[PDB]
Amino acid sequence: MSNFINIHVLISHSPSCLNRDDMNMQKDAIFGGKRRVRISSQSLKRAMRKSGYYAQNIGESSLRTIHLAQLRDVLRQKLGERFDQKIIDKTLALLSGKSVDEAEKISADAVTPWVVGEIAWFCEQVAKAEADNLDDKKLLKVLKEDIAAIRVNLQQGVDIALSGRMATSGMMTELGKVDGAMSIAHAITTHQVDSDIDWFTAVDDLGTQEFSSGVFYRYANINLAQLQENLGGASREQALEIATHVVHMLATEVPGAKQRTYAAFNPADMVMVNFSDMPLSMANAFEKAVKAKDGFLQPSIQAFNQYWDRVANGYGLNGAAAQFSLSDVDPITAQVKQMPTLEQLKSWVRNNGEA
């Protein structure tokens, strides 16, 4: 029973039109002295969130906004048959800290994530309080007593239980603070994307590099205890189910229309999952930027494996570990159960690292 599960992913896809800044340029980042192409974790997260896989296997995603008026209209249309409009308005008002009239514009302090199931639950508590002659103050007081009952509703807002939420006003300041379970890094390429060439000297002499594809390292880990808590006390099984869908999405999703370069042929380029007591990232396997052989993918896997060996042996990691890669690279010595397909890896995660 280890508390952290670490997801290491090597993914091969285009290095362009993925994640741009304010000036039409693809994001990047310097690592080990070389410029890598970067996809930013906000982008990853939101790409996963709005993905179809998520919609079909996790649920509906949170409703993030700053427009309380329009949220008011939405909540009326979506809950209006179940509570009276006045109870809805009261509830949104108590949670946001703003007055809900029928004005045209009502802004919160910041863009906040909203779960409609959660809001509905609160509507229940508000209406019940109204029938029970409770003032807002002891309402807040009693709600503070059982929070897990509020977190149960995050099973309809899993993205929030995963990546967290802060509130600055309303009752949400004491009932709505959620500490995210999943930590996720920025995707960085394992290699330099600028062509490794001095064009001056080169013109005298008139591994092979890829250009329309690049190899990215994605790291994420999930704090199971934390996920269970944020979900209102759900079981380690439900945890592991969600963590599994995250291993999948992390291993497969590319922001925008684009997808993995070899999407139609294999299901994943390289994936390793590893249970542990303390999270640790493998990015340092690429501090020394990878140099091409037949492209960048298997020299990257080679690096990943060599480093995994040295770290595991050095720091004494005897937690469960599984890896999926259909490349024949020199094998990874430690007790790392190899997985023939992706799905088998996913089922190995679903089963707490034994299947």
Partner 1 sequence: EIDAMALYRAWQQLDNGSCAQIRRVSEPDELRDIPAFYRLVQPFGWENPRHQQALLRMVFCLSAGKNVIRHQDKKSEQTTGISLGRALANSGRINERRIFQLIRADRTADMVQLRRLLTHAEPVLDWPLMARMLTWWGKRERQQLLEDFVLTTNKNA
Partner 2 sequence: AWMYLSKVIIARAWSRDLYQLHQGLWHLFPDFLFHVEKRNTPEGCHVLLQSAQMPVSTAVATVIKTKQVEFQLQVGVPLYFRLRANPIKTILDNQKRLDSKGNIKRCRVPLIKEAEQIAWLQRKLGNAARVEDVHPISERPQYFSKSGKIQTVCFEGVLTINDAPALIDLVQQGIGPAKSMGCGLLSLAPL
Q: Is 264 in the site for partner 2 (CB under 8 A)?
A: no
Residue closer to partner 2 (CB basis): 66 or 202: 202
Site for partner 2 in 117-136 (CB under 8 A): none
Number of residues that bind partner 2 (CB under 8 A): 25
Q: How far is the CB of 125 from partner 1 (least distance, A)?
A: 22
Q: Please, which residue, 22 or 354, has the CB nearer to partner 2?
A: 22
**Within 209-238, which residues bind partner 2 (CB under 8 A)?**
209-212
Say which residues have a Cβ less than 8 Å from residue 230's Cβ, sequence separation at least 6: 151, 154, 160, 161, 162, 178, 179, 180, 181
Q: How far apart are CB 76 and partner 1 at their closest, in Å?
A: 6
- Between 14 and 252, name the residue whose CB sits nearer to partner 2: 14
Report what 104 binds from partner 2, partner 1, none; CB cut-off 5-8 Å by kind: none
Nearer to partner 2 among residue 104 and residue 205 (C-beta): 205
Please report how close the Cβ of residue 80 comes to partner 1 at its closest, in angstroms.
5
Q: Which does 194 bind (CB under 5 to 8 A by kind): partner 2, partner 1, none?
A: partner 2
Only segment of 197-205, 247-255, 279-287, 332-340 that touches partner 2 (CB under 8 A):
197-205
Q: Is 25 in the site for partner 2 (CB under 8 A)?
A: yes
Pick the closer one to partner 1 by CB: 110 or 148. 110
Residue span binding partner 2 (CB under 8 A) among the ranges 18-26, 85-93, 153-161, 242-250 = 18-26
| Interacting residue ranges for partner 2, rule: CB under 8 A | 14-17, 20, 23-26, 193-195, 197, 199-200, 202-206, 208-212
